[PDB]
């Protein structure tokens, strides 16, 4: 029933509130505590309404500013969730201001607080899925560009190829590095990291195979097909490493049912 926090960022933001809810429940099992009046919660609830309203606007701005259709589809249901839970909190504060000892008002308080927790988790998760999709798009870009190696036959096209690829790789590596730090499972971290390391080591090897090929074509020594094949093998081993990374990232997410 209680939501699962998948990344370290999400855990840091939500875990403490989840703990606070449990503390309140446990506190209420003690005889000295249950029976006591819940103080006036009008103002503290007004603060929550204000923060919910801010979160919904920021989310709506995030929905109207993105190309991510999956995001545009998933966020709204989460807005409905937190708003509904917020409504319960507002109701409970009303009930508790006339009857500070209501047991059903206290239940509304806990249910509203739990609902906000899970609605916020869902929202943070959706936003996290989308960030991961951005990383996957970059990897997929690099994967596509790796096949451009097949149309490179001149030394000039090679220099262009190298100019364009190097920075794409550097950017992929940074994103993977950032991502590995969000993960809660070491299994995935080392997979991602070792794969990225292998692709980085293969780059100069690919660029060298492409050069040998161009040179051979020019100089004409007859060994052109060996050169092509070797270049293709390199592209092939790099492409498999990247596909592995894409797959681990997809495994590291897709998490919620939504989309």
């Amino acid at each position: 029933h209680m939501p699962v926090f998948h990344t370290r960022t999400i855990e840091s933001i939500l875990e403490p509130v989840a703990q606070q809810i449990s503390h309140l429940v446990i506190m209420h099992e003690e005889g000295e505590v249950d029976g006591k009046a819940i103080p006036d919660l009008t103002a503290p609830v007004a603060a929550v309404q204000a923060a919910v309203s801010n979160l919904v606007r920021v989310g709506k701005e995030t929905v109207q500013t993105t190309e991510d259709q999956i995001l545009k589809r998933d966020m709204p249901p989460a807005f409905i969730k937190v708003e509904n839970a917020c409504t319960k909190l507002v109701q409970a504060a009303q009930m508790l201001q006339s009857d500070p000892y209501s047991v059903p008002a206290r239940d509304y308080l806990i249910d509203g607080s739990r609902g906000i927790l899970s609605g916020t988790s869902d929202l943070l998760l959706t936003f996290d899925e989308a960030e991961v999709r951005k990383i996957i798009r970059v990897c997929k870009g690099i994967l596509e560009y790796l096949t451009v190696a097949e149309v490179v036959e001149t030394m000039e096209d090679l220099v262009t190829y190298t100019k364009n690829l190097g920075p794409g790789m550097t950017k992929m590596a940074k994103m993977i590095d950032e991502r590995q730090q969000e993960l809660t499972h070491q299994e995935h971290r080392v997979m991602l990291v070792n794969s990225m390391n292998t692709v980085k080591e293969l780059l100069p090897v690919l660029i060298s195979a492409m050069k040998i090929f161009v040179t051979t074509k020019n100089s004409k020594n007859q060994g052109i097909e060996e050169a092509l094949k070797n270049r293709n093998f390199t592209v092939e081993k790099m492409s498999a490493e990247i596909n592995e990374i894409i797959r681990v990232l997809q495994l590291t997410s897709w998490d919620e049912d939504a989309w």
Binding site: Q20, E32, P44, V48, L55, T120, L123, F127
Partner: peptide
């Protein structure tokens, strides 16, 4: 930004739960 907005909501809910504790206990 979204992350800061969620931190603010988590903050408001924590303060609310803390205020719900009896005066005093």
């Amino acid at each position: 930004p979204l992350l800061q907005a969620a931190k603010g909501l988590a903050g408001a809910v924590s303060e609310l739960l803390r205020s719900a504790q009896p005066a005093s206990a």
